[PDB]
Design an enzyme around this catalytic site. Structure first.
Site, PDB file in Angstrom:
ATOM      1  N   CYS A 180       0.806  -1.211   0.000  1.00  0.00           N
ATOM      2  CA  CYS A 180       0.000   0.000   0.000  1.00  0.00           C
ATOM      3  C   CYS A 180       0.844   1.268   0.000  1.00  0.00           C
ATOM      4  CB  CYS A 180      -0.944   0.012   1.206  1.00  0.00           C
ATOM      5  SG  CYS A 180      -0.204   0.658   2.719  1.00  0.00           S
TER       6      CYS A 180
ATOM      7  N   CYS B 205       1.308  13.876   6.205  1.00  0.00           N
ATOM      8  CA  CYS B 205       1.408  13.200   7.493  1.00  0.00           C
ATOM      9  C   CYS B 205       0.346  12.117   7.641  1.00  0.00           C
ATOM     10  CB  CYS B 205       1.286  14.206   8.640  1.00  0.00           C
ATOM     11  SG  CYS B 205       2.632  15.408   8.729  1.00  0.00           S
TER      12      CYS B 205
ATOM     13  N   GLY C 156     -35.215  12.118  30.804  1.00  0.00           N
ATOM     14  CA  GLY C 156     -34.828  11.530  29.541  1.00  0.00           C
ATOM     15  C   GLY C 156     -35.766  11.918  28.416  1.00  0.00           C
TER      16      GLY C 156
ATOM     17  N   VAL D 267     -36.594   9.987  35.326  1.00  0.00           N
ATOM     18  CA  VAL D 267     -35.461   9.377  36.010  1.00  0.00           C
ATOM     19  C   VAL D 267     -35.718   9.388  37.510  1.00  0.00           C
ATOM     20  CG1 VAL D 267     -32.963   9.396  36.309  1.00  0.00           C
ATOM     21  CG2 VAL D 267     -33.977  10.202  34.162  1.00  0.00           C
TER      22      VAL D 267
ATOM     23  N   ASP E 108     -27.983   8.032  21.028  1.00  0.00           N
ATOM     24  CA  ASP E 108     -27.858   8.992  22.120  1.00  0.00           C
ATOM     25  C   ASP E 108     -26.600   8.756  22.950  1.00  0.00           C
ATOM     26  OD1 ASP E 108     -30.300  10.196  21.380  1.00  0.00           O
ATOM     27  OD2 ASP E 108     -31.422   8.726  22.564  1.00  0.00           O
TER      28      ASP E 108
HETATM   29  O1  LIG Z   1     -30.441   8.007  34.448  1.00  0.00           O
HETATM   30  C1  LIG Z   1     -30.417   6.780  34.441  1.00  0.00           C
HETATM   31  C2  LIG Z   1     -31.175   6.030  33.375  1.00  0.00           C
HETATM   32  C3  LIG Z   1     -32.515   6.287  33.127  1.00  0.00           C
HETATM   33  F1  LIG Z   1     -33.137   7.208  33.891  1.00  0.00           F
HETATM   34  C4  LIG Z   1     -33.236   5.647  32.152  1.00  0.00           C
HETATM   35  C5  LIG Z   1     -32.609   4.693  31.371  1.00  0.00           C
HETATM   36  C6  LIG Z   1     -31.266   4.383  31.574  1.00  0.00           C
HETATM   37  N1  LIG Z   1     -30.622   3.376  30.801  1.00  0.00           N
HETATM   38  S1  LIG Z   1     -31.466   2.112  30.208  1.00  0.00           S
HETATM   39  O2  LIG Z   1     -32.310   1.626  31.252  1.00  0.00           O
HETATM   40  O3  LIG Z   1     -32.037   2.516  28.963  1.00  0.00           O
HETATM   41  N2  LIG Z   1     -30.294   1.027  29.935  1.00  0.00           N
HETATM   42  C7  LIG Z   1     -30.574  -0.234  29.214  1.00  0.00           C
HETATM   43  C8  LIG Z   1     -30.427  -1.352  30.240  1.00  0.00           C
HETATM   44  C9  LIG Z   1     -29.899  -0.667  31.482  1.00  0.00           C
HETATM   45  F2  LIG Z   1     -30.994  -0.403  32.330  1.00  0.00           F
HETATM   46  C10 LIG Z   1     -29.344   0.645  31.001  1.00  0.00           C
HETATM   47  C11 LIG Z   1     -30.582   5.067  32.569  1.00  0.00           C
HETATM   48  F3  LIG Z   1     -29.280   4.771  32.733  1.00  0.00           F
HETATM   49  C12 LIG Z   1     -29.674   6.019  35.457  1.00  0.00           C
HETATM   50  C13 LIG Z   1     -29.686   4.661  35.669  1.00  0.00           C
HETATM   51  N3  LIG Z   1     -28.836   4.334  36.688  1.00  0.00           N
HETATM   52  C14 LIG Z   1     -28.254   5.481  37.158  1.00  0.00           C
HETATM   53  N4  LIG Z   1     -27.361   5.542  38.152  1.00  0.00           N
HETATM   54  C15 LIG Z   1     -26.923   6.779  38.435  1.00  0.00           C
HETATM   55  C16 LIG Z   1     -27.333   7.947  37.779  1.00  0.00           C
HETATM   56  C17 LIG Z   1     -26.802   9.279  38.164  1.00  0.00           C
HETATM   57  C18 LIG Z   1     -26.072   9.489  39.327  1.00  0.00           C
HETATM   58  N5  LIG Z   1     -25.590  10.680  39.698  1.00  0.00           N
HETATM   59  C19 LIG Z   1     -25.849  11.699  38.867  1.00  0.00           C
HETATM   60  C20 LIG Z   1     -25.323  13.041  39.249  1.00  0.00           C
HETATM   61  C21 LIG Z   1     -25.375  13.456  40.686  1.00  0.00           C
HETATM   62  C22 LIG Z   1     -24.062  13.123  40.051  1.00  0.00           C
HETATM   63  N6  LIG Z   1     -26.537  11.627  37.719  1.00  0.00           N
HETATM   64  C23 LIG Z   1     -27.000  10.416  37.392  1.00  0.00           C
HETATM   65  C24 LIG Z   1     -28.267   7.831  36.746  1.00  0.00           C
HETATM   66  C25 LIG Z   1     -28.746   6.569  36.420  1.00  0.00           C
END
Ligand SMILES: O=C(c1c(F)ccc(NS(=O)(=O)N2CC[C@H](F)C2)c1F)c1c[nH]c2ncc(-c3cnc(C4CC4)nc3)cc12
Lengths: 228, 290, 229
Positions: free
Chosen positions: B38, B46, B76, B81, B186
């Site tokens: 190649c 570069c 979300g 959440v 996302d």
């Molecule tokens: O927000 C979600 C979430 C949700 F709402 C919906 C869906 C999903 N994903 S899913 O379900 O689609 N997916 C597929 C299979 C598996 F389920 C994953 C999520 F992840 C959280 C899940 N667990 C978490 N733990 C901690 C935190 C958090 C902590 N601290 C802070 C700040 C203070 C510092 N911010 C955020 C957020 C989440």
């Protein structure tokens, strides 16, 4: 053996790696007292650089682990690190003794005189990192003597833009900074070398126009890294 | 540019042909590498031979109300959440659609059947789900603070070795998901969180029915926030960090390197900095040309 | 399971000193007892890398021969240097195969070890083929053909088309006829058959399985592209 015979062999070992044989080829050139041309000189410097290039890389990673083990493991890993550096000491003892006893005594031409001394300083700088205490001081001091002596001939007979002269400019400057921890003392020294090259850029030729700038970029990148 | 001979081990790939590279050339400038075959197309910017074997080194449904739900943590695109607790530390998402449609009702059975097996280390492990009053998803709670909070709220700048290792472990996550034939929309730090020891956990990969190069493109913006907290990146860091970001943000899809290559490349970028951490020495003379 | 030496092999791989790694890992086999997958996995890594340099080194040197025509003293040394490699390379092949046939295979119990060990024995015989020519080449290749046969015998009965060890066999065994017997169509059907089974075993995906599965299959699919082109 014949000089034309071994030149071909080196130009093959320069391929397919196996640098151990390549270094052994150039060593047999020296023992008969034969001088080296500009190209014949490169292979000796190129070959020995890579052989010690491997050990330094191996040593640096091994030391990192030993200082990250906190305990019988720490005893074992420390034993392994001390083994690697023993191999390094053999190579430096061989290389400089080859220069001091055979190559340097027969040196006549001005440019070759610089090259022999510059190699002396570099292949003593690597021995410093292993050494500590007065052993480190002496190795730092002794390498400095050769480094300083080499710089004398640089001003007398070499242009402000000479690849070999600029080669000593980079390493000797690093020696004070990296090892002796004299940054601005080395920075002031290195700053001088950069201005010499750019002062008479017109004096360059297409054979070494980019070749000289090879170091110049490194010096600039060294300058930028050190300035902050 | 100057090039020297080199033989590559573990995993390495071409930069022009973008295929496996065992024995080829490497450039001391910008770390450019290419095959000899190649090399005929490689600019100053570069009888092929085959290769061989490389060395390698429904009970989930839960009722409603029993969970001691906590405060709303976020909002979300298709749910609310929350964090709860039921025989353990979990968190539950309150989904939107109050009355499930017949289409997603049976798809709910199969979506559970799909998400029940994705058990990657750097993803937030699935723990449960519920649809008894309304659609809901239960996701493991992070025993700490998320990624976005750390780098933007109460600033705690991480080690560069830790920073890249976070990207390295982040790379381990998305790459495996693509091996499941899953394309993500996302992927962003707004959906990335840090577990114990601030380990990277990636969520928002559910709803396989109700809801790769684009994923790398999204992954490219994620790694931008790491090193920035293009030229704004640290110069002392290995220059190959810039090269990795540059290729990952190409507008054309197939021009962007895929996830499998990046895992090996990220390992390379994490080796040059510790191996060479000092003022640069002198490079020797070039011995190749085209 | 003397971890004192086990960690030493790990260090050398970290230290890149693969010459050191082989000697210690060789002593692991001197215990005689069965070895775990991790303990066994390293042995394939080390001796592969040492042989990796020679096949890189030997091919370049031999390329200079049959090249640069019109020179006597140039090629005289080149022939000696090329055949200088072979004696070194034959040491590894003689040494390793003297170790597989004595310790590992005769004591291997499960299908995991029996398939893995036989496949390794076959692969190293392949590298010996490129050196010799004619009957000397024939005297070696005819030995390896039975090895890839018996190895392919037990693997069909025991382990699945998704098993990590069996899938790798589908790659090299195809190349064996392709590059030593020169039968493209014969090799074309053999490997492509096993490729479909791997697609059929998508449900058997595991965090250990998915890496090897795609990795070999990608390269397995690549061979079809260039060979039939
Ligand atoms: O927000 C979600 C979430 C949700 F709402 C919906 C869906 C999903 N994903 S899913 O379900 O689609 N997916 C597929 C299979 C598996 F389920 C994953 C999520 F992840 C959280 C899940 N667990 C978490 N733990 C901690 C935190 C958090 C902590 N601290 C802070 C700040 C203070 C510092 N911010 C955020 C957020 C989440």
């Amino acid at each position: 053996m014949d000089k034309n015979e071994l030149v071909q062999k080196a130009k093959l070992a320069e391929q397919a790696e196996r640098y151990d044989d390549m270094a052994a080829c150039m060593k047999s050139v020296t023992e008969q007292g034969a001088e080296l041309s500009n190209e014949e000189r490169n292979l000796l410097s190129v070959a020995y650089k890579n052989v010690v290039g491997a050990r330094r890389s191996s040593w640096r990673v091994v030391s990192s682990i030993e200082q990250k083990t906190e305990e019988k493991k720490q005893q074992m890993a420390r034993e392994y690190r001390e083994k690697i550096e023993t191999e390094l000491r053999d190579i430096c003892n061989d290389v400089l003794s080859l220069l001091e006893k055979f190559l340097i005594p027969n040196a006549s031409q001005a440019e070759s005189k610089v090259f022999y001394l510059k190699m002396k300083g570099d292949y003593y700088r690597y021995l410093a990192e292993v050494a500590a205490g007065d052993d480190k001081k002496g190795i730092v001091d002794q390498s400095q003597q050769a480094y300083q002596e080499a710089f004398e001939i640089s001003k007398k007979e070499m242009q402000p833009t000479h690849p070999i002269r600029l080669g000593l400019a980079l390493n000797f400057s690093v020696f004070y900074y990296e090892i002796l921890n004299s940054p601005e003392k080395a920075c002031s020294l290195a700053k001088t070398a950069f201005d010499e090259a750019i002062a008479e850029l017109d004096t360059l030729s297409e054979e070494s126009y980019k070749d000289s700038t090879l170091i110049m970029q490194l010096l600039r990148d060294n300058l930028t890294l050190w300035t902050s | 540019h100057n090039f020297v001979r080199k033989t590559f081990f573990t995993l390495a790939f071409c930069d022009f042909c973008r295929k496996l590279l065992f024995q080829g050339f490497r450039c001391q400038t910008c770390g450019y590498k290419f095959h000899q075959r190649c090399s005929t197309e490689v600019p100053l910017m570069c009888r092929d031979r085959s290769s061989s074997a490389p060395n390698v080194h429904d009970d989930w449904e839960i009722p409603d109300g029993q969970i001691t739900v906590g405060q709303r943590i976020g909002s979300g695109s298709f749910g609310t959440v929350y964090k709860g607790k039921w025989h353990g530390d979990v968190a539950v998402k309150m989904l939107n659609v109050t009355a499930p449609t017949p289409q997603q009702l049976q798809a709910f059975k199969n979506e559970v059947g799909v998400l029940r097996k994705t058990r990657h280390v750097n993803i937030l492990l699935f723990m449960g789900y519920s649809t008894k009053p309304q659609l809901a998803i239960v996701t493991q709670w992070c025993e700490g603070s998320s990624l976005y909070h750390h780098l933007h709220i109460i600033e705690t700048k991480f080690e560069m070795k830790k920073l890249i290792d976070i990207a390295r472990q982040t790379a381990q996550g998305m790459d495996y998901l693509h091996a499941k034939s899953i394309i993500h929309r996302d992927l962003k730090s707004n959906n990335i969180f840090l577990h114990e020891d601030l380990t990277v956990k990636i969520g928002d990969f559910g709803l396989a029915t109700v809801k790769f190069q684009s994923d790398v493109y999204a992954f490219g913006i994620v790694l931008y926030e790491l090193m920035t907290g293009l030229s704004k990146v640290r110069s002392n860091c290995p220059k190959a960090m810039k090269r990795l970001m540059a290729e990952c943000l190409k507008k054309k899809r197939d021009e962007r390197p895929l996830f499998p290559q990046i895992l090996a490349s990220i390992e390379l970028l994490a080796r040059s900095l510790p191996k060479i951490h000092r003022s640069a020495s002198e490079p020797s003379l070039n011995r190749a040309g085209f």
